[PDB]
Scaffold this active site. Sequence first.
Site, PDB file in Angstrom:
ATOM      1  N   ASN A   1      13.230  26.647  28.548  1.00 33.76           N
ATOM      2  CA  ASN A   1      12.609  26.323  27.256  1.00 33.76           C
ATOM      3  C   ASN A   1      13.547  26.844  26.160  1.00 33.76           C
ATOM      4  O   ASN A   1      13.565  28.035  25.848  1.00 33.76           O
ATOM      5  CB  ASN A   1      11.172  26.924  27.135  1.00 33.76           C
ATOM      6  CG  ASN A   1      10.096  26.085  27.847  1.00 33.76           C
ATOM      7  OD1 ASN A   1      10.382  25.332  28.784  1.00 33.76           O
ATOM      8  ND2 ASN A   1       8.845  26.219  27.414  1.00 33.76           N
ATOM      9  N   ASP A   2      14.368  25.929  25.628  1.00 35.15           N
ATOM     10  CA  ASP A   2      15.424  26.241  24.643  1.00 35.15           C
ATOM     11  C   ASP A   2      14.832  26.383  23.230  1.00 35.15           C
ATOM     12  O   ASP A   2      15.560  26.653  22.271  1.00 35.15           O
ATOM     13  CB  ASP A   2      16.504  25.128  24.672  1.00 35.15           C
ATOM     14  CG  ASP A   2      17.875  25.617  24.189  1.00 35.15           C
ATOM     15  OD1 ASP A   2      18.618  26.187  25.021  1.00 35.15           O
ATOM     16  OD2 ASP A   2      18.233  25.415  23.004  1.00 35.15           O
TER      17      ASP A   2
END
Length: 161
Positions: A39-40
Amino acid sequence: MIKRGFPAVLDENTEILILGSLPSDESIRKQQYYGNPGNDFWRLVGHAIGENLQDMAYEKKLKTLKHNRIGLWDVFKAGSREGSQDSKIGDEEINDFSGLKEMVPKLRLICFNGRKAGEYEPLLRGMGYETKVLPSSSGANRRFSKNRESEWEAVFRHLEH
Protein backbone atom coordinates in the site's frame (compact mmCIF):
# COMPACT_ATOMS: atom_id res chain seq x y z
CA MET A 1 -12.96 -15.96 5.31
CA ILE A 2 -14.95 -12.74 4.66
CA LYS A 3 -12.74 -9.59 4.56
CA ARG A 4 -13.76 -7.17 7.34
CA GLY A 5 -13.07 -3.41 7.17
CA PHE A 6 -11.62 -1.14 9.89
CA PRO A 7 -13.22 1.41 12.36
CA ALA A 8 -12.90 5.02 11.03
CA VAL A 9 -9.41 6.54 11.44
CA LEU A 10 -10.85 10.01 11.96
CA ASP A 11 -10.36 13.40 13.68
CA GLU A 12 -13.09 16.05 14.44
CA ASN A 13 -11.10 18.22 11.97
CA THR A 14 -11.01 16.36 8.61
CA GLU A 15 -11.24 18.10 5.18
CA ILE A 16 -10.62 14.88 3.13
CA LEU A 17 -12.18 11.50 4.07
CA ILE A 18 -10.55 8.69 2.04
CA LEU A 19 -12.83 5.65 1.60
CA GLY A 20 -11.03 2.54 0.29
CA SER A 21 -13.07 -0.32 -1.21
CA LEU A 22 -12.49 -3.49 0.85
CA PRO A 23 -9.22 -3.79 2.99
CA SER A 24 -6.83 -6.59 1.88
CA ASP A 25 -6.77 -9.68 4.20
CA GLU A 26 -2.98 -9.03 4.62
CA SER A 27 -4.01 -5.62 6.12
CA ILE A 28 -6.70 -7.29 8.33
CA ARG A 29 -4.26 -9.85 9.92
CA LYS A 30 -2.24 -6.87 11.29
CA GLN A 31 -5.59 -4.88 11.54
CA GLN A 32 -3.60 -2.03 9.85
CA TYR A 33 -3.59 -0.70 6.18
CA TYR A 34 0.28 -0.49 6.52
CA GLY A 35 0.13 -4.28 7.42
CA ASN A 36 1.15 -4.92 3.80
CA PRO A 37 3.82 -2.20 2.77
CA GLY A 38 2.64 -2.63 -0.88
CA ASN A 39 0.00 0.00 0.00
CA ASP A 40 2.05 2.91 -1.44
CA PHE A 41 -0.69 5.26 -0.05
CA TRP A 42 1.76 6.51 2.60
CA ARG A 43 4.21 7.84 -0.07
CA LEU A 44 1.38 9.12 -2.39
CA VAL A 45 -0.11 11.21 0.45
CA GLY A 46 3.35 11.67 2.11
CA HIS A 47 4.96 13.62 -0.79
CA ALA A 48 1.74 15.70 -1.12
CA ILE A 49 1.60 16.74 2.61
CA GLY A 50 5.45 17.04 2.71
CA GLU A 51 5.64 14.66 5.74
CA ASN A 52 7.01 11.11 5.16
CA LEU A 53 4.28 8.77 6.58
CA GLN A 54 6.24 5.66 5.44
CA ASP A 55 9.12 5.82 8.05
CA MET A 56 6.65 6.76 10.88
CA ALA A 57 5.19 3.96 13.08
CA TYR A 58 1.46 3.22 12.30
CA GLU A 59 0.09 5.26 15.26
CA LYS A 60 2.26 8.33 14.33
CA LYS A 61 1.54 8.29 10.51
CA LEU A 62 -2.19 8.39 11.49
CA LYS A 63 -1.47 11.39 13.87
CA THR A 64 0.19 13.15 10.90
CA LEU A 65 -2.93 12.48 8.75
CA LYS A 66 -5.24 13.90 11.53
CA HIS A 67 -2.89 16.95 11.57
CA ASN A 68 -3.23 17.35 7.74
CA ARG A 69 -7.05 16.89 8.18
CA ILE A 70 -7.17 13.47 6.47
CA GLY A 71 -9.34 10.58 7.72
CA LEU A 72 -9.18 6.92 6.56
CA TRP A 73 -12.03 4.41 6.19
CA ASP A 74 -13.56 1.99 3.59
CA VAL A 75 -16.85 1.45 1.66
CA PHE A 76 -17.35 -2.33 2.20
CA LYS A 77 -17.53 -3.13 5.96
CA ALA A 78 -17.62 -6.81 4.84
CA GLY A 79 -17.00 -8.34 1.42
CA SER A 80 -16.07 -11.78 0.06
CA ARG A 81 -12.70 -11.56 -1.75
CA GLU A 82 -11.59 -15.25 -1.80
CA GLY A 83 -9.73 -17.77 -4.02
CA SER A 84 -12.27 -18.42 -6.81
CA GLN A 85 -12.85 -17.86 -10.59
CA ASP A 86 -14.40 -14.36 -10.41
CA SER A 87 -12.87 -13.36 -7.02
CA LYS A 88 -15.42 -10.45 -6.92
CA ILE A 89 -16.77 -8.76 -3.73
CA GLY A 90 -20.02 -10.74 -3.24
CA ASP A 91 -21.02 -9.73 0.33
CA GLU A 92 -22.83 -6.36 0.34
CA GLU A 93 -22.13 -5.10 3.91
CA ILE A 94 -21.48 -1.35 3.39
CA ASN A 95 -20.77 1.54 5.81
CA ASP A 96 -23.40 4.27 6.51
CA PHE A 97 -22.51 7.58 4.81
CA SER A 98 -25.74 9.48 5.72
CA GLY A 99 -23.84 10.29 8.97
CA LEU A 100 -20.82 11.86 7.08
CA LYS A 101 -22.31 15.35 7.74
CA GLU A 102 -22.08 14.66 11.54
CA MET A 103 -18.68 12.80 11.75
CA VAL A 104 -17.02 15.13 9.15
CA PRO A 105 -18.56 18.70 8.78
CA LYS A 106 -15.13 19.97 7.46
CA LEU A 107 -15.39 17.33 4.69
CA ARG A 108 -15.10 18.87 1.21
CA LEU A 109 -13.63 15.97 -0.84
CA ILE A 110 -14.34 12.22 -0.48
CA CYS A 111 -11.43 10.27 -2.03
CA PHE A 112 -12.40 6.74 -3.19
CA ASN A 113 -9.30 4.47 -3.33
CA GLY A 114 -9.89 1.89 -6.10
CA ARG A 115 -12.66 1.30 -8.70
CA LYS A 116 -14.87 -0.79 -6.28
CA ALA A 117 -14.97 2.26 -3.92
CA GLY A 118 -15.47 4.74 -6.79
CA GLU A 119 -18.55 2.81 -8.04
CA TYR A 120 -20.30 4.29 -4.92
CA GLU A 121 -19.20 7.84 -5.89
CA PRO A 122 -22.76 8.92 -7.28
CA LEU A 123 -24.18 7.84 -3.86
CA LEU A 124 -22.04 10.40 -1.90
CA ARG A 125 -22.43 13.15 -4.56
CA GLY A 126 -25.93 13.38 -3.00
CA MET A 127 -24.38 14.34 0.43
CA GLY A 128 -23.33 17.80 -0.97
CA TYR A 129 -19.66 16.73 -0.79
CA GLU A 130 -17.23 16.77 -3.78
CA THR A 131 -16.05 13.26 -4.71
CA LYS A 132 -12.79 12.05 -6.35
CA VAL A 133 -12.20 8.45 -7.56
CA LEU A 134 -8.49 7.92 -6.86
CA PRO A 135 -6.90 4.63 -8.19
CA SER A 136 -5.93 1.84 -5.72
CA SER A 137 -2.74 2.70 -3.78
CA SER A 138 -1.81 -1.04 -3.72
CA GLY A 139 1.34 -2.46 -5.40
CA ALA A 140 -0.87 -4.01 -8.12
CA ASN A 141 -1.66 -0.51 -9.53
CA ARG A 142 1.67 1.15 -8.34
CA ARG A 143 3.78 -0.82 -10.92
CA PHE A 144 1.81 0.92 -13.77
CA SER A 145 0.58 4.27 -12.31
CA LYS A 146 3.81 6.32 -11.87
CA ASN A 147 2.77 9.80 -13.17
CA ARG A 148 -0.82 9.28 -11.88
CA GLU A 149 0.35 10.08 -8.27
CA SER A 150 0.59 13.75 -9.46
CA GLU A 151 -3.25 14.06 -9.07
CA TRP A 152 -2.82 12.80 -5.45
CA GLU A 153 -0.37 15.68 -4.91
CA ALA A 154 -2.97 18.12 -6.35
CA VAL A 155 -5.44 16.84 -3.67
CA PHE A 156 -3.37 16.92 -0.39
CA ARG A 157 -1.20 20.06 -1.11
CA HIS A 158 -4.34 22.23 -0.46
CA LEU A 159 -4.47 21.05 3.23
CA GLU A 160 -2.09 23.89 4.21
CA HIS A 161 -3.00 26.39 1.43
